[PDB]
Design an enzyme around this catalytic site. Structure first.
Site, PDB file in Angstrom:
ATOM      1  N   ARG A  90      -3.487   2.402 -18.307  1.00  0.00           N
ATOM      2  CA  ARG A  90      -2.204   1.908 -17.815  1.00  0.00           C
ATOM      3  C   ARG A  90      -1.896   0.522 -18.382  1.00  0.00           C
ATOM      4  NH1 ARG A  90       0.007   3.690 -12.098  1.00  0.00           N
ATOM      5  NH2 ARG A  90       2.225   3.554 -12.678  1.00  0.00           N
ATOM      6  N   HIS A 136       4.321   7.245 -10.839  1.00  0.00           N
ATOM      7  CA  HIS A 136       4.262   6.522  -9.577  1.00  0.00           C
ATOM      8  C   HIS A 136       3.288   5.353  -9.717  1.00  0.00           C
ATOM      9  CE1 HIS A 136       3.061   5.853  -5.311  1.00  0.00           C
ATOM     10  NE2 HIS A 136       4.316   6.191  -5.060  1.00  0.00           N
ATOM     11  N   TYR A 137       3.424   4.344  -8.845  1.00  0.00           N
ATOM     12  CA  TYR A 137       2.579   3.162  -9.021  1.00  0.00           C
ATOM     13  C   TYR A 137       1.110   3.423  -8.722  1.00  0.00           C
ATOM     14  CZ  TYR A 137       2.482   2.103  -3.888  1.00  0.00           C
ATOM     15  OH  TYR A 137       2.320   2.141  -2.514  1.00  0.00           O
ATOM     16  N   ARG A 138       0.784   4.512  -8.034  1.00  0.00           N
ATOM     17  CA  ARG A 138      -0.606   4.718  -7.661  1.00  0.00           C
ATOM     18  C   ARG A 138      -1.424   5.291  -8.817  1.00  0.00           C
ATOM     19  NH1 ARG A 138       0.842   6.512  -1.600  1.00  0.00           N
ATOM     20  NH2 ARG A 138       0.554   4.458  -0.604  1.00  0.00           N
TER      21      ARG A 138
END
Ligand code: NA
Length: 181
Positions: free
Chosen positions: A113, A128-130
């Site tokens: 990431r 998604h941020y997770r």
């Protein structure tokens, strides 16, 4: 087809080193599974062209690993830039998972990431941020019942698609070996 906001986007990158500010992405692969980890579709497997000056930043580990796998030759011959690789990958993902729904999935996927934030932010934004980090479960298993880990092994070829397939296989192994759901 099997389009669903519950589907999971798995991604693996190969790089010229460990530092996003200094190094570059040389391979990317994606896989979409459903929420039960069944593999629905494999995405573009892209060797991303980089000039020699960027390949010349590679240390011995990277040079020997990516030469012996054939990746360096594919990088030198590639006519695909990061931007085109983003375009291909997004065109694939949009057929299987809606934007912003899937956590980023893989092994120690925070590192990938970081490279996405720096070099492919349009692709990073699709997640998604997770994070679904299979190595989180690896590390908890090593502490809680390390004998479990002798039942699973990886080839670890550093070919991006093969390695992300091994990530999925590892989580499938944990589902049966350490989870009760
Ligand atoms: Na990886």
């Amino acid at each position: 087809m099997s389009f669903s906001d519950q589907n999971l986007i798995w991604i693996d990158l190969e790089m010229t080193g460990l530092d996003p500010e200094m190094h570059k992405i040389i391979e990317m692969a994606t896989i979409v599974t459903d929420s039960e980890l069944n593999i629905l579709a494999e995405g573009p497997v892209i060797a991303i062209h980089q000039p020699e000056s960027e390949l010349a930043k590679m240390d011995e580990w990277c040079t020997t690993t990516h030469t012996a796998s054939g990746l360096v030759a594919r990088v030198r011959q590639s006519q695909v830039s990061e931007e085109e690789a983003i375009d291909q990958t997004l065109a694939f993902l949009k057929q299987w998972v809606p934007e912003g729904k899937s956590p980023i999935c893989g092994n120690s996927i925070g590192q990938d990431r970081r490279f996405l934030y720096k070099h492919m932010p349009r692709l990073e934004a699709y997640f998604h941020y997770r994070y679904i980090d299979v190595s989180t479960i690896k590390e908890l298993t090593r502490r809680w019942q390390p004998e479990v880990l002798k039942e699973f092994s990886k080839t670890g070829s550093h070919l991006a698609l093969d390695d992300i397939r091994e990530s999925i296989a590892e989580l499938q192994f944990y589902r049966k070996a350490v989870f009760k759901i």
